[PDB]
């Protein structure tokens, strides 16, 4: 069939699975583990399918897909069959990632281009979004995701500072989070965490926290730095999943739903599973 599966995610009911390939098709599949019933094909892009993502149920089951065209062509089942419900193109230069935000964060659509620019819009059925962009990195953004959870501002007016936080990863070895500001022009950058000597690849935040927020920033320097935020709002300190160069070229590194079990996809086609050890460092569970 496909000789190569690049990456492949699932919906939020766990009945569908969307395969990003490289022959420009998005094959929507039905998840039954290894076997799948191919229900649809959506060819209509240029070059490798880098990323697709499924919408959080309360803003459809919308599927926003990016290829090397540098455009997100959004697909939506209208009539029980796939069609095109939208188009985007404010940044073209290859859209690498294409994410939907948590329920509380809204139907925000995270675009991250390799021109050092990043869009952040809203999905509308009546149309209209205001074009808000903030510059992340400079040599490009090879992956983007979504910050942990929305915060609370207390007082008499909620949703003031922090709020929707955007985490990105450029090719200039720099990983950091934001803080949506409304009193200082562009998004005031936090702290530049330089701990990389080769381009940043994948970034994932842990939807499981205790007293610190974990941020797995992968790189092509064959290590994964785990950024432990001290008391969750403290500084980001250096905690090493492995201190040494793995003889594996690491790609994705995505956390589980519960737990701080992290899967890192090694270049030798072996997905190690890491748990944090007897100390603050990490040891493999497999």
């Amino acid at each position: 069939h496909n000789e190569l599966i690049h990456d492949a995610v699932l919906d939020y009911y766990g009945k569908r699975l969307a395969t990003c390939s490289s022959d420009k098709t998005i094959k929507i599949f039905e998840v039954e583990g290894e076997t799948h019933k191919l229900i649809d094909t959506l060819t209509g892009h240029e070059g490798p399918v880098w990323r697709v993502d499924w919408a959080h149920p309360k803003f459809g089951t919308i599927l926003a897909s990016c290829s090397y065209d540098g455009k997100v062509l959004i697909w939506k089942e209208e009539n029980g069959r796939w069609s095109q419900i939208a188009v985007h193109a404010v940044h073209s230069a290859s859209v690498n990632s294409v994410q939907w935000a948590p329920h509380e964060y809204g139907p925000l659509l995270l675009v991250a281009s390799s021109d050092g620019k990043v869009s952040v819009v809203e999905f509308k059925e009546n149309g209209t979004t205001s074009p808000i962009i903030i510059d992340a990195h400079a040599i490009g953004v090879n992956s983007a995701s979504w910050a942990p959870a929305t915060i609370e501002e207390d007082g008499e007016h909620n949703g003031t500072k922090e709020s929707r936080k955007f985490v990105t990863g450029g090719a200039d070895n720099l990983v950091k989070i934001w803080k949506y500001n409304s009193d200082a022009q562009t998004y005031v950058l936090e702290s530049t965490l330089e701990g990389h000597s080769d381009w940043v690849r994948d970034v994932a935040w842990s939807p499981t926290v205790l007293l610190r927020s974990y941020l797995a920033s992968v790189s092509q320097d064959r290590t994964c730095i785990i950024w432990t935020q001290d008391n969750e709002q403290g500084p980001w300190k250096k905690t090493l999943l492995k201190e040494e160069k793995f003889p594996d070229v690491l790609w994705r590194a995505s956390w589980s739903l519960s737990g701080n079990v992290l899967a890192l996809s090694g270049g030798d086609n072996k997905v190690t599973l890491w748990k944090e050890n007897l100390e603050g460092k990490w040891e493999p569970a497999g």
Binding site: I5, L10, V31, V249, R252, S254, S265, N269, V271
Partner: peptide, 11 residues
């Protein structure tokens, strides 16, 4: 480079 593999946790 090489083969792309992933590491997304399913349900």
């Amino acid at each position: 480079t090489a083969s792309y593999t992933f590491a997304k946790f399913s349900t």
